[PDB]
Amino acid sequence: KALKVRTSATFRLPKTLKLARAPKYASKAVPHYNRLDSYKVIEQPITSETAMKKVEDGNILVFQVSMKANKYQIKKAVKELYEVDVLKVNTLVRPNGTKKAYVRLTADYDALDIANRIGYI
Amino acid sequence: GRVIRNQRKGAGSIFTSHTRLRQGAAKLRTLDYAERHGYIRGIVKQIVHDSGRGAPLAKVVFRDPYKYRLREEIFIANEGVHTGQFIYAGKKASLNVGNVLPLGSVPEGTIVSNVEEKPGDRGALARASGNYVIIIGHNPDENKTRVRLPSGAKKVISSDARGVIGVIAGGGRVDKPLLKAGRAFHKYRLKRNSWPKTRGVAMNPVDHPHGGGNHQHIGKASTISRGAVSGQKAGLIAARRTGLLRGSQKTQ
Amino acid sequence: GAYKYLEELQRKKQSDVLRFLQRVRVWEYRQKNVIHRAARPTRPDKARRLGYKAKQGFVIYRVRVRRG
Amino acid sequence: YATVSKTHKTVSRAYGGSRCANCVKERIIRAFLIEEQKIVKKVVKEQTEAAK
Amino acid sequence: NPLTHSTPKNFGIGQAVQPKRNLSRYVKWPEYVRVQRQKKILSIRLKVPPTIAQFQYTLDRNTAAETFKLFNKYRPETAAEKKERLTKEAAAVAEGKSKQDASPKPYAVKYGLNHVVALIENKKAKLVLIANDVDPIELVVFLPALCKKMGVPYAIVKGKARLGTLVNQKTSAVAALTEVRAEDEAALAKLVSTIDANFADKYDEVKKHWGGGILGNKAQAKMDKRAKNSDSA
RNA sequence: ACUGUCUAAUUAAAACAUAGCAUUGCGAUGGUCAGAAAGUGAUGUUGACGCAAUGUGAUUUCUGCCCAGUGCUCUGAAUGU
RNA sequence: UUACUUAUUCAAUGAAGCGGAGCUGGAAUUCAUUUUCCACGUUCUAGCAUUCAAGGUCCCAUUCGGGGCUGAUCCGGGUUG
């Protein structure tokens, strides 16, 4: 017969079929539970004398949160455990290496009403 | 003794070339089909100063024969070329200044520069500023061309090696004295690192074959053989004569 | 069998047939990698008497060493 | 230049924000006269092949 | 015609970027392609000894067609065929008081290099087909000469793959016929006469012919035109 | 000659550097140098108006004689080793 | 001593036009007639060159579209020295 027409001088690798993985056994056989669920995200409220001033005046809940949590997970954890919609979340890493979150609630919710719903004054 | 300075020159730590501001490797076009069967026409777009070099360089843009795009090559600017000139590269191009032709297609006595050694190595000889080779003759069988290099040394090379007609610009550069250590500083600042080369006779016996003594003198003959050893080659290597050249060196 | 004929024939390395084979093969092995997988022994009886058997999990690798 | 509209980055002409109305002007002069000279260069060789 | 205008391009050098042409002559192949091509090229440019050169003196296509047509009649038993025969003989020996002989004597091709070489040395094979493709040629270079020593007729045939198809292997590199049904003795005799006329009679003068030394077609062209411009003025 | 540089922590100088002058090697299968080696590198993104190796140390005016010695080098020599 | 390219060595390239023959073109002289050689798309100009290419031709079942040859000579798969 004849041979195929090559319009380029380069040979590249053929696009061969690559199959998906179909294992004969499971990877670890038990899916892990939620590493950073809502009770592990927010650990403990911060009740210092100046943190208590933010609850009354700033409409801000000062929480100590986990060192792995980002601002989405803290916005979702406060909303889950207390059923409160959240305005903005500001976090910092304290000089003892733990995290503190300044969760600001919306104007519909009085943070001083939620503060003694949680049980710290 | 310790390792002397020209043995440290080859390890290439601080003695490499200071190549930041260079515009690129000055090169002819590669021998494609157009360069060896007919010609092709480029445009010189810019004549530009290249650091570390005395000659100016010319960006010449060409049309890619096989793809719709433009290819910019960086020639060495021959004397006379101007931005906007059409440069004709190829076998059947014309004998004008700027056109790069194979050496088989030029008459004897043609003054070309940037001339290849092997056909396809994109420019080797007559390439610093002011220099040029002279095509002195053809041997059309086993097709070769005797040219005369800028050092006066005659050389037979291939008749398909190319070269650009004319001499290379920036010539007469070294007729101006530097006058200053600052100008020699800034001269070698963009080339390498060998400006302040302390005389080997003022060093110590570790640092050189010439160092030491209660007077500054070489002590033994400064003409060193070719079959000497790295570390001994300090002075005039394989010097077949010395002293002031009186008479016609100027080889026939 | 054939292995006795091959065993005697791989002893005449100066004969014309073996030096032509040595030239062609020493070009071919030089063209490939330094350590590369061989699909089968080129000396099947010399491999066989050194312990090789043509079953799965017996592997031949060709390899190149600088002399001197 | 990605926040502003199209009319801040162009002028209304061929080669708007790329060339400068005088290099565009010589581009039209040069395109017209060489391609008209190529029409001359076609037929001026058609008399040499007709008279050789 | 109407508003469609014939504008040809000018694909000469300097104008009109060249169209996509068949550059299969100039494609930079993978390294295994170049090795497997220049291996054949190098085995052609070198002057080969005569005891390798006798391969590529292969049998012609008509005689090859007749030989594979005869050898298809004695293809050995397959695995399901062996299963059906093992049941039909094991029951017979166990109940019918047979001496494991209620299955007839098989006529089949003989194969495998040690088997076939041992059959040639015993002067028991009636025909030996030899592959020309085997990559260590030392396996089979003695198979012509031994067949000339033993009086066994031999044919070098194209295809170790084609030999493997007749024997239900992948390749088999050699094949032999030792016993043949009497319905095929005449066809085996005519095929053996043709194969002796092509291989065994030619052996003692083929044994001196150094092969190879064949130039490439650029060097062939150069050499012929050197002969035609120098001598033929 | 200048401007400049160096002995941090005893010597800032007449020492070193410098431009200027001169000599040498080398046309890339190359000169000089590096690596234990390498399908390895520096000069080199270089090409004699260049790279490499030295001597002298601005300018003016000059740079004499010696190739026996010790080196270097040669399109050489030959019947010694 | 000088020849070969296949070992080896060097170099260039998104290994793109290598080798041989042809086609018309003409130099060119024919002692029978074509026996050989050079060509074989680009040069006033800082424009432009891309959508298997327009056109010529043949299919499909004409709907809008798609394919083959040619345009762009054949042959050998030695990338080119």
Q: How far apart are CA C65 and CA E54, in angstroms?
A: 35
E-chain CB neighbours of A11 within 8 Å are 27-30
Nearest to E126 by CA among E54, E53, E74: E74
Q: Is residue A49 within 8 Å of residue A56, measured between CB atoms?
A: no
* Cβ atoms < 10 Å from Cβ of D42: 9
Whether E138 has its CB under 8 Å from any CB of chain C: the answer is yes
| Residue reference for tokens 């003892």 | A96
Residue type, A67: M
Quote the DSSP letter at residue A20: P
The secondary structure of E131-200 as a DSSP string is ES--SSGGGTTHHHHHHHHHT--EEEES-HHHHHHTTTSS--SEEEE----TTSHHHHHHHHHHHIIIII
Task: State which residue of chain E sits closest to A8, comparing Cα positions.
Answer: E23
| Spacing of B242 CA from F80 C1' in Å | 32
E-chain CB neighbours of A9 within 8 Å are 23, 26-28
Q: How far apart are CA B55 and CA A102, in angstroms?
A: 67
Find all residues with CB under 8 Å of A58, minimum gap 6, and list them: A104, A111
Subunits with 3+ C-beta pairs closer than 8 A to E = A, B, C
| Spacing of E27 CA from G22 C1' in Å | 27
Q: Is residue E157 within 8 Å of residue E143, measured between CB atoms?
A: no
Q: Is residue B212 within 8 Å of residue B206, measured between CB atoms?
A: no
**Domain parsing of chain D, residue ranges:** 1-52
Shortest distance, CA C55 to any CA of chain E (angstroms): 16
E-chain CB neighbours of C42 within 8 Å are 136
Find all residues with CB under 8 Å of B63, minimum gap 6, and list them: B40, B42, B70, B71, E17
Q: Is residue C40 within 8 Å of residue C65, measured between CB atoms?
A: no
Size of interface C-E (CB pairs under 8 A): 53
Q: Which of the residues A3, A4, A5, A6 would you substitute to probe the E interface, choosing the one with the greatest number of E C-beta atoms within 10 Å?
A: A6
Find all residues with CB under 8 Å of D24, minimum gap 6, and list them: D13, D14, D15
Burial class of E223 by CB neighbour count within 10 A (0 to 12, 13 to 18, 19+): exposed
Q: Is residue B161 within 8 Å of residue B105, measured between CB atoms?
A: no
Give the method of determination: cryo-EM
Whether A6 has its CB under 8 Å from any CB of chain E: the answer is yes
Yes or no, beta carbons of C24 and E46 under 8 Å apart: yes
Quote the DSSP letter at residue A58: I
Chain-centre distance for alpha carbon A72? 5
Dihedral sign from CA coordinates of E49, E54, E56, E57: positive
Lookup: nucleotide whose C1' is closest to D38 CA? G42
A-chain CB neighbours of E20 within 8 Å are 7
- Asked if strand G comes closer than 7 Å to E217 Cβ, the answer is yes
| Spacing of B222 CA from G25 C1' in Å | 71
| Residue reference for tokens 């030792």 | E178
Whether E231 has its CB under 8 Å from any CB of chain C: the answer is no
Whether E53 has its CB under 8 Å from any CB of chain C: the answer is no
| Positions in chain G where some atom is under 7 Å from a protein CB | 4-8, 11-21, 40-50, 52-56, 71-72, 76-79, 81
Lookup: nucleotide whose C1' is closest to B125 CA? F47
* Cβ atoms < 10 Å from Cβ of B182: 10
- Quote the Cα angle for D33-D34-D36, to 5°: 65
Q: How far apart are CA B41 and CA B89, in angstroms?
A: 6
- Asked if strand G comes closer than 7 Å to A12 Cβ, the answer is no
Distances (CA, A) of D16 to B50, B204, D6, E163: 33, 71, 11, 75
Subunits with 3+ C-beta pairs closer than 8 A to C = E
- Asked if strand G comes closer than 7 Å to E97 Cβ, the answer is no
3-state secondary structure of A14: coil
Q: How far apart are CA A2 and CA B102, in angstroms?
A: 39
A-chain CB neighbours of E27 within 8 Å are 6, 8-11
